[PDB]
Amino acid sequence: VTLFVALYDYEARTEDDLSFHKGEKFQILNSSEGDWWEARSLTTGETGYIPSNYVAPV
Amino acid sequence: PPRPLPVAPGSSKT
Protein backbone atom coordinates (compact mmCIF):
# COMPACT_ATOMS: atom_id res chain seq x y z
CA VAL A 1 0.00 0.00 0.00
CA THR A 2 2.16 2.91 -1.22
CA LEU A 3 0.64 4.56 -4.31
CA PHE A 4 1.48 8.18 -5.22
CA VAL A 5 -0.20 10.64 -7.61
CA ALA A 6 1.60 13.28 -9.70
CA LEU A 7 0.79 16.80 -8.44
CA TYR A 8 2.20 18.24 -11.69
CA ASP A 9 2.72 17.10 -15.30
CA TYR A 10 6.22 16.24 -16.57
CA GLU A 11 7.87 15.44 -19.93
CA ALA A 12 10.83 13.06 -19.49
CA ARG A 13 13.59 14.70 -21.58
CA THR A 14 15.18 11.24 -21.97
CA GLU A 15 13.91 7.73 -22.77
CA ASP A 16 14.62 6.54 -19.21
CA ASP A 17 12.44 8.97 -17.23
CA LEU A 18 8.65 8.75 -17.71
CA SER A 19 6.09 11.29 -18.98
CA PHE A 20 2.63 11.95 -17.51
CA HIS A 21 0.28 14.73 -16.35
CA LYS A 22 -1.18 15.91 -13.02
CA GLY A 23 -3.54 13.09 -11.95
CA GLU A 24 -1.37 10.16 -13.10
CA LYS A 25 -1.13 7.28 -10.59
CA PHE A 26 2.28 5.71 -9.90
CA GLN A 27 3.53 2.66 -7.95
CA ILE A 28 6.90 3.43 -6.34
CA LEU A 29 9.03 0.29 -5.91
CA ASN A 30 12.23 1.95 -4.66
CA SER A 31 12.92 5.54 -3.53
CA SER A 32 16.01 5.14 -1.33
CA GLU A 33 18.50 5.26 -4.23
CA GLY A 34 18.62 8.99 -5.03
CA ASP A 35 16.19 11.94 -5.02
CA TRP A 36 14.49 10.21 -7.98
CA TRP A 37 12.34 7.11 -7.39
CA GLU A 38 11.34 4.31 -9.80
CA ALA A 39 7.56 4.38 -10.35
CA ARG A 40 5.37 2.22 -12.63
CA SER A 41 2.30 3.70 -14.36
CA LEU A 42 -0.67 1.47 -13.44
CA THR A 43 -2.45 2.71 -16.59
CA THR A 44 0.22 2.27 -19.28
CA GLY A 45 2.19 -0.52 -17.57
CA GLU A 46 5.56 1.13 -18.33
CA THR A 47 8.09 1.67 -15.51
CA GLY A 48 10.81 4.34 -15.20
CA TYR A 49 12.06 7.06 -12.83
CA ILE A 50 10.27 10.30 -11.90
CA PRO A 51 10.86 13.29 -9.62
CA SER A 52 9.93 12.22 -6.07
CA ASN A 53 8.96 15.84 -5.32
CA TYR A 54 6.23 15.45 -7.98
CA VAL A 55 4.41 12.54 -6.29
CA ALA A 56 2.61 12.11 -2.95
CA PRO A 57 0.86 9.29 -1.07
CA VAL A 58 -2.71 9.29 -2.46
CA PRO B 1 24.65 14.18 -8.30
CA PRO B 2 22.48 16.88 -9.90
CA ARG B 3 19.13 15.22 -10.73
CA PRO B 4 16.60 16.30 -13.37
CA LEU B 5 14.31 17.30 -10.45
CA PRO B 6 12.20 19.80 -12.42
CA VAL B 7 11.02 22.97 -10.64
CA ALA B 8 7.56 22.61 -9.06
CA PRO B 9 5.11 25.00 -10.76
CA GLY B 10 2.54 26.95 -8.71
CA SER B 11 4.81 28.17 -5.89
CA SER B 12 7.64 27.88 -8.44
CA LYS B 13 11.09 28.63 -7.01
CA THR B 14 11.80 32.17 -5.74
* Structural domain boundaries enclosing A36: 1-58
For residue B8, list chain A residues with Cβ-Cβ distance below 8 A: 7-8, 53-54
Q: What is the CATH number of the domain that holds A40?
A: 2.30.30.40
For A21, left (φ over 0), alpha (ψ -120 to 50), or beta?
beta
Domain count, chain A: 1
CB contacts under 8 A, A 33-52 vs B, are 34-36, 51
Q: What is the 3-state secondary structure (H, E, C) of A1-58?
A: CCEEEECCCEECCCCCECEECCCCEEEEEECCCCCEEEEECCCCCCEEEEEHHHEEEC
This entry's atomic model was obtained through NMR
